[model samples]
Target: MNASDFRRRGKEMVDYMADYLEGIEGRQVYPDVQPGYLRPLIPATAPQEPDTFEDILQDVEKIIMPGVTHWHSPYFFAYFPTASSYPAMLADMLCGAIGCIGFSWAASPACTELETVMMDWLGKMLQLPEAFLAGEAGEGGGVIQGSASEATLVALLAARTKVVRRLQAASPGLTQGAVLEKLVAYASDQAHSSVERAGLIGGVKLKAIPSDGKFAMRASALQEALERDKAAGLIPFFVVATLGTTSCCSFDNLLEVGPICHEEDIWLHVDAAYAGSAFICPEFRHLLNGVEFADSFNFNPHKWLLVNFDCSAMWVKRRTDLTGAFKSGLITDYRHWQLPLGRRFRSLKMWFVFRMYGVKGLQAYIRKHVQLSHEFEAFVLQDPRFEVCAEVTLGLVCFRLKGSDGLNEALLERINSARKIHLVPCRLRGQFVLRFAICSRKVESGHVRLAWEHIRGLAAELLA
Candidate 1:
């Protein structure tokens, strides 16, 4: 009801949260509720009278707990991991208290300046090309986006505007609308679906270039497609290269693909939403080869790093490339960098996490999960009935049955039906595959062992 009450209840709430996360191992990995399960649990309309805090907190446990998928559970091996850290959570509390609407530098100088400084800190941590870091006299910089999908879309729009402007300038008689009609973009068959959606929303053609047997996009394939499109009078303006894809976590051959984009003068945008955090560790830095040739790149700290969600870091080779697309002037407005005008004080958490985890701490965290993933890999290999479907890179392990797709499908169905552990399926080549992404804050080899045994038991039951 007042600041005094908030102080008392907030502390209690933090204690409640700590207890829940500490005991998450005992909870279900996913909810058993069907569609519309939440609708019947709560009132359809707001009550005329205000509810008390105690009653509301009670409802949180009663109504919300049943429909929740315990993402922090050690058994949660689905999708990708969202960030979880006490430091990040505490920073978010400060962020909300400040409640600054940081759209422009005038709105809140601290918001904009801290973001630029933090982005540079993170950029140097990743050993990013200097062109993407914001320092004294630098021509390029980084910004925080709400998600990787938004970063991809923003980069696509900038590329579209650049090409159309060039075309109109070369021929003063050319209409901007006509130039837009001939514009085309390229991404690999293994690229995320968001690439296709970006093109659709931009009103341009996005061609899916075929990948090699390894599920990697080669420069040769991209060049061939570019030549064919040019012959047809199509203008190729953008190429999206995925450092870590969603389906099997396959990486497009950026070392090969980047050079092709440079020679062709296409905007190369690298979407490393899941794998980018691993770059901070020296052992995995080579996976980011060819980043020097990229026009833009992005990854989610909210995915693997110890930061909160809505904290995707995106950097560009030239600040003008992004801001100039929206405005012909010298305004460094963040609103120009993204679709939405309002920006949260998100850099607070970035600053907090970077300081708390230091470089070594974050690197160790990544190494631990990656190590657990390999343990699961060995566990899969021990069972002759199943085979690894993709190269184990970082924290994801893709595997499937040795027999027909039908058998793997049945096994996956039974895996989810049990719901002790969570996993998803991906199609690699022609075989149906199960995706075991090492998630959760405290997931260990023991949890991975438990998940694999559960799956193995289900397979034995299915085959028998």
Candidate 2:
């Protein structure tokens, strides 16, 4: 469409977007349509002629809306948060319009420069160490990855490269393949699956460090693993300490684990994808204390900081440590930092979000979610029939019926089938548990209360 058409159409689209989110509670939280439902609804192939904008707009409600999961709906409690906000959306629109393929500074100077400064801004907001800040002469810096998974992989590969270089320097005759075969990495068994995948992609053996009763990776467990690997002539080169794990919001004992890694000369990488947003508040900053010992760290602003997706923030103690894996000396060519060559103007969203919300506003947003989680936790405790499976640390509440796994599974089925509110399940210490994550920017105590009532009713029916 031309500029004239875009002006009117964009205005209309914005209105529609607002209406969708504002009135989303009235719509079903989960889709009623089944798989392959869309296949029969439209042509199998593209049309020979351009379709009218009006027709496409009508088709969105007729076709797309029917199959959507409505993640931004207040009733959605599955997975973790995927942030959404007007500032982020408007910045995304501007990014799309500018449409700079900012692979290098030369490709788009403003894009690269904005990203560098924005990363520093976020690093400061998190109270990161001076080593991680990319000031005039800092050795370390940050980058924006597409997701936490990518950040994990990137850090893993960089650790692999660093260890290989050091080992080769010590033993001149050692072959790269031999060193690679002996290389080992570690993460808590409670760590996200993506950590294991990162080891696989990096060509290293990833050993699972057993978590303690609280589902946290303790220092003793990790220390024992390191000694065992050393006894076997294996090189312990990397360890990923998860600050906030996926199944529950359990945190690894970073204070203990960090010093162990430091003494062992192993690279420590921290992944705090979901819970990192809370660090903006002073009360929650202690959760990130041991980050000072980490060689690299990552978290997703897109997950909980109210920025749109594709904005995972990552930092390293030494930029050269990461760059040595591939190459770099910035004017900051982002293509070298990530897997792909094409980079979007993603920092625009961060610029918009950080300014629009300010630090205090973002802190309030995080505090609200944490408080709501406590409210939900209270509800779970009051019901004797249900037991809390994990500690209600942040926005996730892990609880289950005090009965057989089969009964909980049946209850979950009933809840989802009813489609009034949505939730997903996780297994905690062998018990089936329902995970109530405080998602959606619009979620309130009323919505949480409604969801609990729905769940309680389902359990009552199951018991009957």
Candidate 3:
């Protein structure tokens, strides 16, 4: 469409979107469509002729709406929060309009500079150490990655390069393949599966340290693993200490684990994808204390902060530690920093969100969801038939029926079948637990109450 038609069409689309979100509560939280439902709904091939915009819009409601899982609905209590805000959405639109591939500094100077500045801004907000920020002439800096998984992989690969280089320098006959076979990495048993994937992709052995009763990785367990590996002629080169794990929102004991990694000369990478946003508030800052000992750290602003997806913030204490692994082109080219050679103008989303919601406003947003989570936790405690499986921290509440795993599994199946409110499940210490996360921006106490009542009714039906 030309500019004239674009203006009218864009405004219409905006109105359509606003109405859909406002009326989302009246719709079902999850889709009832079968596995192959979407394939049959649309044409097998593209139309030979152009279709009117009105016709396309009609198809969105008639065909698309039926297959959608409304993630932004207030009743969506699934995996974790994916941020949504008007300011970020608008910036995304502008990003697409500019359409610049920010691979090198020469390609788009503003793109690289804004990202560097924005990362520094976020670092200070989290009270990160000076070593993680890119000051006027600092040796350390940060970058934006597509997700927490990418950040973890990047850090792993960088660590691999550093260790291999050091080994080669000492023993000129040492081959990369030989050293790679002896390399070992560590994470808690409760760490995300992506950590294991990173090890596989990096060609290293990944060892899982045992977690304590609270599901935290302690210093003693990590030290024992290192000693065992050393005795076997294995090189312990990397450790990923998760600040907030996926299964139960449990935190690894970073204060204990960090010093061990430091003394052993292993790269300590902290993964705090979901819970890192809470660090902006002073009360939750203690959880990030041991980060001072880390070589690299990462967290997803897209997960908790108001920026949308594809905006994970990662920092390194030594810039060369990352660049030396892959470089030789433009000094500020982000292509050297990430897996992909091309990158979108994602920092605009961060710039917009941070400006629209000042630091205080963002803190209030985090505090509200945290408060709602505790409110839901209280409801679970009052019901004697249900028991909380994990300590309620941040926005996730892990609870289940006080019965066999099979019983809790049946209850979760019923809850999804009803489709009134959406929830996911996780395994915590052999118990089948329900995961009720504060997912949507519009979620309130009323929605939390409604979800609890729905689950309670489902439990009654199943138990009877």
Candidate 4:
């Protein structure tokens, strides 16, 4: 499109987005389309001629909207919330327009410098230890990763490399493959799947310590496992303590786990993907009680901090360890502390988000969501027919109908069929449970109430 057409269409697109978000509640939270519903909508081969912007817009409602699971809808209370705000969206647009690939320091000075500065700004906002900041004198530093999974892997790899280097210094004949077989990692059973995946990718053995009654991994359980592994001649190199787990939003005993890891000389990495946003609030800062002992910490601003996806914030006490893991002696030109080459201008959006919301605005948003979750929890408790399955420490509520797994399953199925709200299920302590996560940027107390009412209505029908 030419400049005139671009101006007209861009304005229209902005209005379309605003209208969609404003009317999101009226739309189905989950689509009910059958399989292959849009198979015949387009040709198998690409068309030689370009389609007009008008044609694309027409198809969005007719074809695209029907297949979408409305994650941005206020009624969406499934899995974890991926919240994005207007400010973040606008910043992302500018980033796309700039389109600079920041692989090296020379590529885009603004990209690298702004990212480093913004990461420090965020670290300060979270009240992170001085070690996690980057300046002329700071020991800790932060970096923007694409996801929590990538950050986890990066941490695991750093630990692995540290252990390997230590072993090699003691025994010159030791090789990487030999060290890999003996390296071990630990996480709570309630931890995100990404922790286990990180160990697997790094070629290390990952063990899950059974959680306590609250679904939290206790220091005692972790100690027992660590002693067992030590006796077995295995190297316990890493421990990933979770702040807000995926299954039930349970927190591991980081106070105990952190000290043990430090005493045992193991790398401690904390994954606070969901609950990190709440850290901006003084009341919720206790959720990260043992963060002081962590070698690396990661959380997703994309999930709760109003930033879009691909913005997982990671902090490391020392950058050399992480950078060393991905280093290659054959490539002497590469830096010692970054991923292999090209980094995006991801910091622009993060910087925009931080400045736009400020600490007070972000805290207010998080506080509102946490309050809404508690309200829903109260509703669940008042009803004798339903029980909370996990600890309601944050914005996620894990509850289920008082019957067989099939009953809850049928209830969820019926709820999805109705499409008024959408929820996902989790298995907690061998029982089927529904996860009600308050995640949308526009979600309010009313949305939470409506979701609870919808769930109650579905349960009544299923129970009968």
Candidate 5:
């Protein structure tokens, strides 16, 4: 398309997006289409001639829209929310248009420098320690990762390398494979699955310590496991303490876990993907209490912050340790820290989000969701047929029908069949439970009330 055609089509596309967002509530939160709905829509092979933009747009409505799950709808209370805002979207569009590959400082000085500045800005906003700032003259610094999973894997690798280097220096004849087999990592049983996957990918042995009745990982359990591992000739090199667990938003006791790691000489990495955004509000800052003791910390701004997907902010006590772990002599042309040689302009969207929603605005946004969660919790508490399955922290409400697992399963099925609201199930302490996370940018108290009513209606029908 030419410049004029591009402008006209872009305006139309913008309108389309606006309309979709504005009227999303009227559409089904989950798609009604069956599997393989698009097989007959297109040819198996690519066409030799280019298709007009109009043809692609037609397919977007006919084929793509029907298969999409409307995550932005107010009734979407499933899993965790990947929040997106107009300001972030606009910035993302600009970044795509500019398309600067910022692998090195020289490749795009603005991209590299802006990222450094934005990381510092975000750290300050979250009340992070001065050490995490880039220009604070400290060893610690922050870097933007693609997701919490990547951050966990990167941190695990860093701890593994650090332990290996230390052991190698102490004992000259130590074999790399033997040392790797001896290396160990720890996390709460309630921790996200990604932590174990990271340890597997890093080739380290991982242990999931059991949590207390409150669903928090206690330091005593961790210490017991560490002592046992040490006695068995295993080296506990890393501890991944979770801030908000995936199953029920349970928090690990970092205050207790941190000192034990310090005493044991284990690297402490905090994964706060879902609940980290709460720290933006001063009221929830307590959730981050032992952050100073962490060697590295990671959280997803895209999960709760106004930024779009693919933005996970991670900070380390010492950047050298992380960069040193990933550095290779052959790839000398790019920055030593990142996984990939080519980096996108991710800082632009974060910069725009920070500017558009100042610290106070972000805090208010979080507070609103927390309030909604409490409202749902109260509804669950009042119902005789239902009971809360886990601690209600942050925006997730984990509850289930009070009878058999089959009854809860049927209730969940009925609720989803209604299509007025959407939720997903999770296992908590060996019980089937439904997770109601208030994640939509447009979600409000009324939506929560309506969802509760819908859920109660479904439960009553199931019991009948």
Candidate 6:
């Protein structure tokens, strides 16, 4: 379409977007789509000619809408929330139109500068140590990664570099192969699967320390593991402590883990992808108690802070550690921060979101989710057949039935098949448990009541 056509059609598209979000609850939370459901529709290849707007729009309704899982729907409670807000949406529209490639500071000063400032804004919102803010005039700084997975890998790589350089300085004869062979990392057994993947990709052994009854990795367990590894001549270079684990919202005892990492000079990285947003609220700030001792930390605002996807905020106590992986004093190309060379104007979304929601508004949003989760827990407790599997610490509630694991699995299957609500299962201490997170921008008390009723009805049917 021409510029004039875009002017007219863009307004129409915006209205459609608003209506879709406003009326999302009426749509199915999960798609009925099976594999290869789209193969038979329309054509196998791209059209040779540009289709009319009306024709393309018609295809969107007929082909796409039916297969979509409405993440914004109030009934969606499968994974953690991928937050959505109008302010973020509007900024993304401009981000798309401008399409600046902010690989280096000089590429687009506005892009780079805004990102630096935005990172500081978010770091303060999380009450991060001053060392993490870019304006602190220290070696530390912050940057926006595409996801927590990328942040984990970046910190691992930096930790890898620091140890290799140190070893090489002490013994010039130390070979790259030998240095890498002894290198190791550590994380709790309850850490996300991506942490293990980062270890695999980095070509190092990442030991999984067993967690305590609350699912938190204890400092004592980690220290014991480190001593054993060191006795065997293995080098422990990094330890990733989770602020909130994925299976359940169980937090690793950073207060205990952080000091150990500091005493050993190991790079400590905290991954709080889903829980970090809650840190913006005072009531939940205690969960990040020992973060000041960390070398690097990261979380995904897209998952909880009302920002859209691709906005993972990461901070380091020293930027030199991460930047040292690339080169000397040259242009601070963010391309050196993480794996990718291309970065979108992601900070625009953060800028819009922060400005529109302010600190108080965002805190209320997080508090509401936590309150709803407690509400869900109450519902689960009132039922004799249902028992909570994990401590209700934040917005996630992990629970299972009092019967066999098979019964719990069947109940989850029936709930999803009904298309009334969506939930995902996690194995908690060998028992099959279901995770119900307070997802969706519009989730309310009514939605929680409805979700519990749907789950209860299914359980009653299975028990009968």
lDDT of 2 at 97: 93
Estimate the TM-score for candidate 6.
0.98
lDDT score, candidate 3, position 105: 83
Tens-place lDDT digits, model 3, residues 1-464:
79888899999999988989899998898998888888888889999998888999999998999989888999999998888888888999999999999988888898888898899889999999998888787888899999999999999988999999999999999999999999999999999998999999998999999998889999999999999999999999999999888888999998998889888889999999999999999999999999999999999999999898979999998878887777621138677678998898999999999999989999999999999999999999999999998898899999999999999999988988888888889887767888999989989999999889989988998999
Candidate 5 off by > 4 Å = 328-334
Model 1 worst lDDT window (10 residues): 324-333
TM-scores for every predicted model: 0.98, 0.98, 0.97, 0.96, 0.97, 0.98
- Model 5 gets an lDDT of 0.87
Candidate 1 vs 5: which has more lDDT? 1
**Which residue segments of model 4 deviate by more than 4 Å?**
328-340
The stretch of ten residues in a row with the least summed lDDT in candidate 4 is 328-337
Quote the positional error of residue 327 for candidate 2 in Å.
2.9
What lDDT score belongs to each candidate, Candidate 1 first? 0.89, 0.91, 0.91, 0.86, 0.87, 0.90
Better of 3 and 5 by lDDT: 3
Writing each residue's lDDT as its tens digit, candidate 5 over 377-397 gives 999999988899877879999
Write model 4 residue lDDT over 1-464, tens digit each, in one string: 78798789989999999988889888887887878989789778887999888899989988999999889998888999996788888888888778888777677778777877888888888898887887666666888888888888888888999999999999999999999999999999888999878987888999999999988888899999999998999999999999888989988888989999999999999999888878878888888888999999999999999889978899888777777788711111123444547767888888788888888888889888889999999999999999988778789999999889998899888987887888889898788998999988888888888889888987887777
- Alpha-carbon deviation at 396 in model 5, angstroms: 0.5
lDDT of 2 at 13: 94
Between 1 and 2, whose lDDT is larger? 2
lDDT by residue for model 2 (1-464), tens: 79999999999999999999999998898999989999889999999999988899899989999999989999999999899999999899999999999987888899998988889899999999888888777878888999999999999888998999999999889887999999999999889999989998888899999999989999999999999999999999999999888999899998999999999899999999999888888898999999999999899999999989989999888888888887622437667667778899999999999999998889999999999999999999999999988888889999999999999999999999999988999988778888999999989999999889989988998999
lDDT tens digits, residue span 1-464, model 6:
68999999999999888888988988987888887888898788998988888888888888899899988899989889997999999999999998989988777878877888888889888888887877836567788898999899999999999999999999999987899999999998899988999999999998999999999999889999999999999999999999889999899998999889999999999999999999998888999999999999999999999889989999888778998876621225678787888888889999999999999999999999999999999999999888999899889999988989999999999988899999899997788999999998889999999999988988888999
Which parts of model 6 are misplaced by more than 4 Å?
328-332
Clashing pairs in 2: none
For residue 93, model 3's alpha carbon misses the true position, in angstroms, by 0.8
